[PDB]
Design a protein around this ligand. Structure first.
Ligand code: HEM
Ligand SMILES: C[C@]12CC[C@H](O)CC1=CC[C@@H]1[C@@H]2CC[C@]2(C)C(n3cnc4ccccc43)=CC[C@@H]12
Length: 471
């Protein structure tokens, strides 16, 4: 006969305890695969089942193609310009399309995507080779390689080794990622509006520096540019721009700031995602020597040492394809994609969703659904193979590492080639070992905009059999 306390507020688990994406997924046992939390005025819906997710992303994909406002995203996107963090509409549709259309200047020519990639991988391998017998962090050499790839695709410039501008990019990259969100993007409680903090101030200084740096390349490129040379991304965007004076409906959408941010998004997305996945891949091979050995045998049997690996090679290095697929399952780069938002009054699984409501797909939930996968916690590349190991299969519909629909990733083709190639070249040539202290990388992860792995070292060695075939 004692009374319930008045309740001003309720949350279903602790903030800043454990990973968000896993917290949400544990909740699916009591509350089912779809539920909502209310923050002040803002309502957020979380979706943990492939069918409900495919509804959000494909079937009613335009209804949910929105992105919410966040004070952090604002600053990194110079107030919702660019692609990723721009809302649905005029500006987004064009720049998305333009960047997608650029991926075609590399279908097959002097600058075939596979060539640009390989030349930068050749360099990575030569730099790696001098560290023969040593334990190292590979984060930066890889970062360089994929920075040059993304540079070549953007500007047709790359950097010489030792170019200081690389270390500057690295610094502001680490900064922006660090301050963009504490953990995940999805912030149950908005602490940054509650307690005095320096977070937005920090982030403006890093982005100011990124902006300064891309502004230099932009002005200076105005000289090189010619309307009868479309070889790279800035040319796609400037060609579209002077295609906006007739007697101009697309000129407002392509100011220098709009162009800045778009390149920024591609420059960033291009570097940080794939470096993380490479780091994640080595980490998994270090914990799984049996898979590593079977990767050596496969590359030996099928490529051998007579030449260097090729895009065509994905048709015979099947276990390598399956490993990548399984790193993308088990540690998805974006475990909750990026937040969607209802453009209009709509529904999911026939529940009402109001215009402007935040919608998150829990990719991690999909990728660990125990009804959809055998032993979802486990690193099992075999799961993407038929039992005899002679062909790739799709064991589950509950698999969307690159998302789906209108907000899907535009960099999948680039990402996929890059990752297979980097891993292929690295295996052909290097023994990759636990460094001389028995320290194995933690596989827990660090959720930010990208799902990162704690930094770690590998003992790098030139392969017996690679030196053999050098006589
Ligand atoms: C391992 C590599 C990658 C993975 C797993 C990945 C996955 C994703 C996912 C899951 C999304 C968001 C889907 C959503 O919000 O519903 C996304 C968005 C995006 N990705 Fe990637 N991505 C990768 C690499 C790349 C690369 C290399 C690029 C560079 C060209 C890139 C460019 C973008 C852009 C611009 C968006 C925003 C799309 C939009 O809002 O319209 N991504 N990606
Ligand atoms: C913050 C950062 C990376 C560091 C840079 O200094 C600033 C920057 C620019 C745009 C961001 C990018 C990281 C990844 C983002 C968010 C991204 N993106 C593209 N594919 C992704 C897959 C998973 C997570 C993010 C993904 C699209 C635009 C990208």
């Amino acid at each position: 006969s004692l009374l319930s306390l008045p309740l001003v507020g309720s949350l279903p688990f602790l903030p800043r305890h454990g990973h968000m994406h896993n917290n949400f997924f544990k909740l699916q046992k009591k509350y089912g695969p779809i539920y909502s939390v209310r923050m002040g005025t803002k309502t957020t819906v979380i979706v943990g089942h492939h069918q409900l997710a495919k509804e959000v992303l494909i079937k009613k994909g335009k209804d949910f193609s929105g992105r919410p406002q966040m004070a952090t995203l604002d600053i990194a996107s110079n107030n919702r310009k660019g692609i990723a963090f721009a809302d649905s509409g005029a500006h987004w549709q064009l720049h998305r399309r333009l960047a997608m259309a650029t991926f075609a200047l590399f279908k097959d020519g002097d600058q075939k995507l596979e060539k640009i990639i390989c030349q930068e991988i050749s360099t990575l391998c030569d730099m790696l080779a001098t560290h023969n017998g040593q334990s190292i962090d590979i984060s930066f050499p890889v970062f360089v390689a994929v920075t040059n790839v993304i540079s070549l695709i953007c500007f047709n410039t790359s950097y010489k080794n030792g170019d200081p501008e690389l270390n500057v990019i690295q610094n502001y990259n680490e900064g922006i990622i660090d301050n963009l969100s504490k953990d995940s993007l999805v912030d149950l409680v908005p602490w940054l509006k509650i307690f005095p903090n320096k977070t937005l101030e920090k982030l403006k200084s890093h982005v100011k520096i990124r902006n300064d740096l891309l502004n230099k390349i932009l002005e200076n490129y105005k000289e090189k540019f010619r309307s009868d040379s479309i070889t790279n991304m800035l040319d796609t965007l400037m060609q579209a721009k002077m295609n906006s004076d007739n007697g101009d409906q697309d000129s407002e959408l392509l100011s220098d700031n709009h162009i800045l941010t778009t390149i920024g998004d591609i420059f960033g997305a291009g570097v940080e995602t794939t470096t993380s996945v490479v780091k994640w891949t080595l980490a998994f091979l270090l914990h799984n020597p049996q898979v590593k050995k079977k990767l050596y045998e496969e590359i030996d049997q099928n490529v051998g040492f007579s030449r260097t690996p090729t895009i065509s090679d994905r048709n015979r290095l099947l276990l390598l394809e399956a490993t990548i697929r399984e790193v993308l399952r088990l540690r998805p780069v974006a475990p909750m994609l990026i937040p969607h938002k209802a453009n209009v009054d709509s529904s999911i699984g026939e529940f009402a969703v109001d215009k402007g409501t935040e919608v998150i797909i829990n990719l991690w939930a999909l990728h660990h659904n125990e009804k959809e996968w055998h032993q979802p916690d486990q690193f099992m590349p075999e799961r993407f193979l038929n039992p005899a190991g002679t062909q790739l299969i799709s064991p589950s519909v509950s698999y969307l590492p690159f998302g789906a629909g209108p907000r899907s990733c535009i960099g999948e083709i680039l990402a996929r080639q890059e990752l297979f190639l980097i891993m292929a070249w690295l295996l052909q040539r290097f023994d990759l070992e636990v460094p001389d202290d028995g320290q194995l990388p933690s596989l827990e992860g660090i959720p930010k905009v990208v799902f990162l792995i704690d930094s770690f070292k590998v003992k790098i060695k030139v392969r017996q059999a690679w030196r053999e075939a050098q006589a």
